[PDB]
Paper text:
[name] is a tissue-restricted BET subfamily member expressed in pachytene spermatocytes, diplotene spermatocytes, and round spermatids. Based on proof-of-principle knockout and in vivo chemical biology studies, [name] is a validated germ cell target for small-molecule contraceptives. Deletions of either BD1 or both BD1 and BD2 in the mouse [name] gene result in male sterility, indicating that [name] is a testis-specific target for male contraception. Our drug discovery campaign on [name], a validated spermatogenic-specific contraceptive target, yielded rapid discovery of potent and specific inhibitors of the second bromodomain of [name] that have unique binding characteristics to [name]-BD2 relative to [name]-BD1.
[name]-1102 was identified as a potent, BD2 versus BD1 selective compound with enhanced metabolic stability over other compounds. The overall structure of two molecules in the [name]-BD2/[name]-1102 crystal was similar, with one [name]-1102 bound at each acetylated lysine (KAc) binding pocket (showing an rmsd of 0.25 Å between shared 97 CA atoms). [name]-1102 binds to the extended pocket consisting of the KAc binding pocket, ZA channel, WPF shelf, and a channel formed between ZA and BC loops. Specifically, the aniline nitrogen interacts with the side chain of Y308 in the ZA loop, whereas the two internal amide nitrogens form hydrogen bonds with the backbone carbonyl of Y350 and the side chain of N351 at the BC loop. The aniline ring binds deep into a hydrophobic pocket consisting of nonpolar residues from the ZA loop (V298) and B and C helices (Y308 and C347). The indazole ring docks to the WPF shelf (W292, P293, F294), the ZA (V298, L303, and L305) and the BC (H355) loops, and the C helix (V357). The following m-phenylenediamine ring is partially accessible to solvent and docks to the channel formed between the ZA (H306 and V311) and BC (Y350, P352, and H355) loops though hydrophobic contacts. The terminal amide does not provide any hydrogen bonding interactions, and the terephthalamide ring docks to a shallow hydrophobic surface consisting of N307 and V311 side chains at the ZA loop. Two ordered water molecules mediate [name]-BD2/[name]-1102 interactions at the ZA channel and the KAc binding pocket. The backbone carbonyl oxygen atoms of P293 and M343 form hydrogen bonds with the aniline and indazole nitrogens through ordered waters.
Residue numbers in the entry: 262 to 379
Write the structure that this text describes.
Amino acid sequence: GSHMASVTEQLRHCSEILKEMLAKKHFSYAWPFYNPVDVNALGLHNYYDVVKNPMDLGTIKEKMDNQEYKDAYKFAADVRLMFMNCYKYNPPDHEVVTMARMLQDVFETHFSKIPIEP
Ligand SMILES: CNC(=O)c1ccc(C(=O)Nc2cc(NC(=O)c3ccc4c(c3)c(-c3ccc(N)cc3C)nn4C)ccc2C)cc1
């Protein structure tokens, strides 16, 4: 009751974080993560044998909208899964790895400041 009000309010902060990562200020490094990776358009070999749980910001926003996250920790897991998929598949100095780490710095710095009860 009381506890649920706090959990839902954290997921509201997660909504604010998601909208921040979708803001035009981050577009130059966030755009590869807006939608599912277009494996066919980029000619990516064996993507679905390296990355078994694909995740992107669009799917996260759909899960948010369906109210699919039970709490903020599971929201964070998906964001972090999305970034980890990109570290797993691409060469460590690839340009999208640099982009993943820049967008991830935005997520991690904001997520770390969500209060325990609010
Ligand atoms: C057992 N099998 C294996 O172990 C294995 C098999 C094959 C590969 C293999 O081919 N890696 C590989 C990937 C790239 N990457 C690209 O060329 C590129 C270009 C543009 C992109 C992207 C990627 C993405 C993107 C793709 C995936 C994710 N998750 C997130 C994002 C953001 N987005 N955009 C715009 C280049 C070279 C190599 C060798 C590695 C290991």
